Design a protein around this ligand. Structure first.
Ligand SMILES: Cc1nnc(N2CCC(C(=O)N3NCC[C@H]3c3cc(F)cc(F)c3)CC2)o1
Length: 252
């Protein structure tokens, strides 16, 4: 089931086309649990969510195979020479909301939503990725064996609090900012105790640090989504209800 061979990093699959792949002694004790987890994550099927295409479960060699995304991540695309128009940026936002509302609907809480986890195709359409394996516990353990700017403040200096749907809504708010500032927030200052405590105090990325035009509605949306109280933040279906009419009438 959903098993690949190395005989079948950018990888040209033998029969099913272009794909992205991410590659220790074999431990038969965890192979069944890894295969079960990949099958589980493979059940996540949405137009704006990255599709986990396959796995390579071989002796001492483990790999995860996802689909190809030509233009790389959202930060790479924003920091490019050619500027991205408001209509494209607004579409990217709507697609992020859709992909996140799908994940939340399937009980998946991202925990690590950031521009590096938003992949872009040639046609500037996006897909939500989990490149840091935050939603794979079995496979994350293999990766570790012998950025905090998008993190909700309830998790900063508090590892034990269980993340929620509202933890992702906070991350979205900073992605929203980054889309308009065309850069990473907080002047790219090393994640420090000064910075963590400041964010916890109430500090947010500088809205006035956005030089290009950002509509009134999008500033309100990011300010509402990065609220200190998680209960005051909207849901992704809630955000969609307001954002889809705004994109159609004003941004498209
Ligand atoms: C190279 C390379 N480096 N990493 C990988 N992976 C690991 C992440 C995988 C991934 O994005 N997903 N798995 C299936 C659905 C999707 C997903 C998206 C979310 F927004 C949240 C999720 F919980 C899961 C793709 C393969 O391949």
């Amino acid at each position: 089931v959903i098993k690949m061979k190395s005989s079948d990093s950018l990888a040209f699959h033998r029969t099913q086309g272009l794909m992205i792949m991410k590659t220790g002694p074999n431990c038969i004790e965890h192979n069944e649990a890894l295969l079960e987890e990949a099958k589980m994550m493979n059940r996540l099927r949405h137009s704006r969510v990255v599709k986990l295409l396959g796995v390579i479960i071989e002796e001492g060699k483990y790999s995860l195979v996802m689909e190809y995304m030509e233009k790389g991540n959202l930060m790479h695309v924003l920091k490019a020479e050619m500027s991205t128009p408001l209509s494209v940026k607004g579409r990217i936002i709507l697609e992020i909301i859709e992909g996140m509302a799908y994940l939340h609907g399937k009980g998946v809480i991202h925990k690590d939503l950031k521009p590096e986890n938003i992949l872009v195709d040639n046609d500037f359409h996006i897909k939500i990725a989990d490149l840091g394996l935050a939603s794979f516990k079995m496979w994350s353990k293999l990766n570790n064996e012998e950025t905090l700017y998008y993190m909700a403040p309830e998790h900063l200096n508090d590892v034990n609090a269980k993340p929620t749907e509202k933890s992702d809504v906070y991350s979205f708010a900073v992605v929203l900012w980054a889309i308009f500032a065309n850069k990473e927030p907080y002047e790219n200052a090393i994640a420090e105790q000064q910075l963590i405590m400041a964010i916890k105090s109430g500090n947010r990325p500088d809205v006035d640090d956005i030089t290009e035009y950002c509509p009134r509605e999008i500033i309100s949306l990011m300010k509402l989504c990065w609220e200190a109280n998680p209960e005051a933040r909207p849901t992704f279906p809630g955000i969609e209800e307001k954002f889809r009419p705004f994109y159609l009438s004003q941004l498209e």
